[PDB]
């Protein structure tokens, strides 16, 4: 890889610089280089990895949605404009799929296998579910049902671990549950499952806030608010 000649510490340092400069494509490249050094990531390093690709793929998804909406309208009294909209949507889609494939490959080589602590293992399985979910969002062929099940299977293993090993207010446990509920609602055609999961997740975290130190769980509160937002939109 192009990052093979750079020191691991320098990759991590430059990923944090790229984060400050909102250069997320660079940030993702540096963290991919860091993973490929073969050592496990620390808690802070896992966050750099996930934030980088979340933002890269986030922009691709938003652009794919714009184009796919234009494409849908073109297939409704709509004038034939030729192949250009489909071509450009496919271009963006193929690039999106390539980023998802890259992330999934990294998790498979060798983040998931080497993760023993529950936090890291749930973290990486959540990521695996997310990037299979993004592949599902654009899937339309024979593989859609298989891609959906790959996301479910990853999310479910993460869920089983998080309930056995983590407290209900753990931010990774909460964020896994948020995204699995989003999976149920938007991908798996299971809005009732999505709603039940978001509600029990929110309720069980509320009941456990009393154990927590002030100012130590700002991320958990943010996620609980996202659960509450989704429930308000869904009910």
């Amino acid at each position: 890889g192009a990052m093979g000649s750079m020191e691991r510490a320098s990759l991590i340092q430059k990923a944090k610089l790229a984060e400050q400069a909102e250069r997320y494509e660079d940030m993702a490249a540096f963290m991919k280089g860091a993973v490929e050094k073969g050592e496990e990531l620390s808690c802070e390093e896992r966050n750099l990895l996930s934030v980088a690709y979340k933002n890269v793929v986030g922009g691709q998804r938003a652009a794919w949605r714009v184009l796919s909406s234009i494409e849908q309208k073109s297939n409704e009294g709509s004038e034939e404009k030729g192949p250009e909209v489909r071509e450009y949507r496919e271009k963006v889609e193929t690039e999106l799929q390539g980023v998802c494939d890259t992330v999934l490959g990294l998790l498979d080589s060798h983040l998931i296998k080497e993760a023993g602590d529950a936090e890291s293992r749930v973290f990486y399985l959540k990521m695996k579910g997310d990037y299979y979910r993004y592949l599902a969002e654009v899937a339309t062929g024979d593989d859609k049902k298989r891609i959906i099940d790959s996301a479910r299977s990853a999310y479910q293993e993460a869920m089983d671990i998080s309930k056995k090993e983590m407290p209900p207010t753990n931010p990774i446990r909460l964020g896994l549950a948020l995204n699995f509920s989003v999976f149920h609602y938007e991908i798996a055609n299971s809005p009732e499952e999505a709603i039940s999961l978001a509600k029990t997740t929110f309720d069980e975290a509320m009941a456990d806030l009393h154990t927590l130190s002030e100012d130590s769980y700002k991320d958990s509160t943010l996620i609980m608010q996202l659960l509450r937002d989704n429930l308000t939109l869904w009910t």
């Binding site: 997310d130 964020g175 948020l178 995204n179 989003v182 609602y185 938007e186 943010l222 996620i223 996202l226 937002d229 989704n230 939109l233």
Partner: peptide, 5 residues
């Protein structure tokens, strides 16, 4: 807007 994290 459905939110994820």
């Amino acid at each position: 807007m459905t939110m994820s994290v």
